[PDB]
């Protein structure tokens, strides 16, 4: 079919971009995921998940000022508009973030730990043990791919040979380098899991279609299954 | 009604008229030739007669080749006459079991060879058989120059041949311009495959590539009639003067 993806823009901007829905269909045009269709129209706001992204003419630790914390219809968390130097960008807001705060983005790993403030971005080897974190990355410069959802938070367990042991929201441990940047604190909208849809129509506004009426018989996959926490996932090559 | 000629002869009737009739002779002979390829995916009997064990009589035996399907990606490499075998099988080799579709594919590798006549390295896709055939010919140049077309089974292998034969006929000095002695030594090893340039420039070309070539050799703006009539005039005036 003549399907073209809307994710064509090649330059970053804070302007809300118009995106088109899929309906659970792939480029072939056939349904590949059920339960997706319709919903209120939405404009996408690019999010910069690389906190430490010095400007073209600048290098080293920099600071940004929070301008506005607003609602995002493309994610469960809230986004914040920060401005440093001559540029502006969207980021994931933390639990306690207001218009007027000044956040820090640094890559310096000092001999000693640093007093951790919420919203600040430091490497994993520059934070004390037991510190809550969010938006971690697998390797340096990869970009934050974890702990992005509302209220989610990790914790730093220990540091070993330039490697940090991270505990994910699924109570699973992940091992990465100490040069990977993470943000301190929890993610915004802590009470998102306590929302009540109330009526079926409100799920049709979110782009969710009703389940199939066909009756299925359960198999052996069903039923409680007490299995042990899987081993630690390591992105460090030795 | 009926056709004057059978349908299987229509393709050779197109080579008698038109621009194809104006093609070289040696090229046209190489097309109608249907020499048998070398067996790859089956063993030949080796003899013409055998003694059937059941009755003990001298029966005749014939070698029937197995159809081989050559994918288009085989014309960009050197598979050595190998290809896919599109056939059937019996489950558990039992005739009374049901019959299934089976495809046997060859194992391909991406190697790098060097040609001495061309002084250039190519990254071709090959099979284990091609590597053995290059070791029996003692180089890639002999393999490309000895092996015929029906055994090469590659358009790229036939274009290399044309490239090599053109340098053996033109005696191209571009090969090692700064090493005359070395160059001469290379052409003295492949002197048994030398073919005149006139005949070595049509090697490997298909019927569609040759027609386009011959068309370009005949393409020329028509001569104006102003010049033709002047020649007739001047030539005619001279004859008139003699009679006077």
């Amino acid at each position: 079919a003549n399907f073209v993806s809307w994710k064509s823009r090649t330059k970053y901007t804070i302007t809300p971009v118009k995106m088109r829905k899929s309906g659970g269909r792939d480029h072939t045009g056939r349904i590949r995921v059920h339960g997706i269709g319709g919903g209120h129209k939405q404009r996408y706001r690019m999010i910069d998940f690389l906190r430490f992204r010095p400007e073209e003419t600048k290098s080293g630790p920099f600071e940004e000022k929070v301008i506005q914390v607003r609602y995002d219809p493309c994610r469960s968390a809230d986004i914040a508009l920060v401005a440093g130097g001559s540029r502006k960008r969207w980021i994931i807001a933390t639990e306690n973030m207001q218009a007027g705060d000044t956040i820090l983005n640094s890559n310096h790993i000092g001999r000693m730990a640093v007093a951790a403030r919420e919203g600040d971005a430091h490497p994993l080897g520059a934070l004390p043990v037991g510190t809550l974190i969010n938006n971690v990355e697998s390797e340096p410069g990869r970009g934050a791919q974890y702990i992005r959802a509302a209220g989610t938070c990790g914790v730093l367990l220990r540091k070993v040979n330039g490697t940090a042991i991270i505990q994910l929201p699924s109570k699973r441990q992940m091992q990465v380098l100490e040069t990977c940047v993470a943000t301190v604190g929890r993610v915004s909208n802590v009470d998102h899991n306590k929302r009540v849809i109330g009526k079926a129509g409100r799920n049709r506004w979110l782009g969710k279609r009703p389940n199939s009426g066909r009756w299925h018989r359960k198999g052996g996959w069903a039923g409680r299954k007490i299995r042990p926490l899987p081993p630690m996932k390591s992105y460090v090559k030795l | 009604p009926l056709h004057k000629y059978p349908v299987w002869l229509w393709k050779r009737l197109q080579l008698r008229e038109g621009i194809c009739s104006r093609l070289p002779g040696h090229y046209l002979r190489s097309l109608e030739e249907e020499r048998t390829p070398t067996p790859v995916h089956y063993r030949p009997h080796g003899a013409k007669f055998k003694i059937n064990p059941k009755n003990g009589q001298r029966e005749r035996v014939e070698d029937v080749p197995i159809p081989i399907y050559f994918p288009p990606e085989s014309q960009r490499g050197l598979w050595g006459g190998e290809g896919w075998i599109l056939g059937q099988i019996y489950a558990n080799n039992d005739k009374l079991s049901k019959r299934l579709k089976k495809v046997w594919k060859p194992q391909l590798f991406e190697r790098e060879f060097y040609s001495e006549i061309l002084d250039k390295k190519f990254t071709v896709t090959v099979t284990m058989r091609t590597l053995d055939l290059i070791d029996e010919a003692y180089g890639l140049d002999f393999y490309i120059l000895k092996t015929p077309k029906e055994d090469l089974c590659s358009k790229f292998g036939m274009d290399l041949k044309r490239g090599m034969l053109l340098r053996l006929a033109r005696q191209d000095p571009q090969l090692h311009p700064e090493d005359p002695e070395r160059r001469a030594a290379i052409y003295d090893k492949y002197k048994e495959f030398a073919i005149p340039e006139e005949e070595a420039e049509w090697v490997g070309l298909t019927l569609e590539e040759a027609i386009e070539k011959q068309r370009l050799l005949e393409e020329k703006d028509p001569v104006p009639l102003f010049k033709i009539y002047v020649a007739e005039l001047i030539q005619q005036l001279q004859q008139q003067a003699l009679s006077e």
């Binding site: - | 104006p224 009639l225 102003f226 009539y229 002047v230 005039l233 001047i234 005036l237």
Partner: protein, 124 residues
């Protein structure tokens, strides 16, 4: 229920179809921004009409005329009438060479001309 055996015309189809289809009239310009059409004076055919004053010929010819036979004109017929006389004269004079063929009337090329013969760039 559609007539697939009827001539497709600009009168058929929705608004976008009826405006894009024409009738065979050649264009004399282009559309600019704002749907503003720009007319090119050089694209409009200029009629070259001659003066018909004191012209003897008339639409018809009197029947009191001979039944001359038809001799279609050929290239060889045109060469001998116009080009040959000049060549014969120079041949007798003793000064004739191919280099001067352009002087006799021959055209080596058609470029740099207003009315080229092939491919012709003028109207009947």
């Amino acid at each position: 229920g559609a007539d697939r055996m009827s001539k497709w015309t600009s009168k058929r189809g929705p608004r976008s179809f009826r405006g894009r289809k024409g009738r065979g009239a050649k264009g004399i310009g282009f559309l600019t921004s704002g749907w503003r059409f720009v007319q090119i004076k050089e694209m409009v055919p200029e009629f070259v009409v001659p003066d018909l004053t004191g012209f003897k010929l008339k639409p018809y010819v009197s029947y009191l005329a001979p039944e001359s036979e038809e001799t279609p004109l050929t290239a060889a017929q045109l060469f001998s009438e116009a080009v040959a006389p000049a060549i014969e004269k120079d041949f007798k004079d003793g000064t004739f060479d191919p280099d001067n063929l352009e002087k006799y009337g021959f055209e080596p090329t058609q470029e740099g001309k207003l009315f080229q013969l092939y491919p012709r760039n003028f109207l009947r």
